[PDB]
């Protein structure tokens, strides 16, 4: 399959050079497969999801994507037009308030949640978490986060947007996770990435087009953008049988574009995401 005039994100992680603008991707499209978006939510009503997202757990008053970053986050993963995996299947496990922020007790508590519900789903080509969030260095966080990792689900966390080493920053610097840094439309790491040897692979993060709140769309910029190419990408690769929830992370490091990237600090990996289809 092929997309025209895709967000540069998607055309940039099926192609070995910059400046395309087709998405290919194999038809499969990642169906078979559920990612858990954990953030401030998902607009599940969305036209873009076509039914394919639903809010599965809040730990505030509503369940409603008040802020815009996880309905954003959630459309890179496998929205329609602005997703990855366009045939996935979206949950949303409230953590965050309508500000963009939580406890780390409560963060937690979602990521338990994650790694017990998965056995009541139907997700036969595996389960992805991805979690576009964080803050300073917590050894419970990391803990939380290798538990779920290790309960069979592919764990996809941002690495920060501080341009500093991710050592001190949780989940980012939990190693057994699949850690991921920013990069922008000319492979540049993007301005605000965070580095650092704990990082495990680039994704596109400046100006990333997706869904929004109120069922709209626009432009944002993050690590907290890169890291939903990631999680949609290991949905991708375990639907098309490529690799399992253990091991995704690996198997994305070695089959990426590698020494594309500029402004990579020695230390840090020189890797971006690529889904290696030929039609
Ligand atoms: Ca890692």
Known sequence: AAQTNAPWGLARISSTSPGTSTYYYDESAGQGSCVYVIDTGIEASHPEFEGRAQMVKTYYYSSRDGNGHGTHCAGTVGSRTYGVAKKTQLFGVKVLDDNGSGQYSTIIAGMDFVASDKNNRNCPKGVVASLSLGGGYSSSVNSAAARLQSSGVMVAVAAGNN?????????????????????????????????????????????????????????????????????????????????????????????????????????????????????
Request: hydrophobic share 35%; with cysteine; aromatic share 10%.
């Open 163 to 279: 341009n500093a080493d991710a050592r001190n920053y949780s989940p980012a610097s939990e190693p057994s996770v699949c850690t991921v840094g920013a990069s922008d439309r000319y492979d540049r790491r993007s301005s605000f990435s965070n580095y650092g040897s704990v990082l495990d692979i680039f994704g596109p993060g400046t100006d990333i087009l997706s869904t929004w709140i109120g069922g709209s769309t626009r432009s944002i910029s993050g690590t907290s953008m890169a890291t939903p190419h990631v999680a949609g990408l290991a949905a991708y690769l375990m639907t098309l049988g490529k690799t399992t929830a253990a091991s995704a992370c690996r198997y994305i490091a070695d089959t990426a574009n590698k020494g594309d990237l500029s402004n990579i600090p020695f230390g840090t990996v020189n890797l971006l995401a690529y889904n290696n289809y030929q039609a």
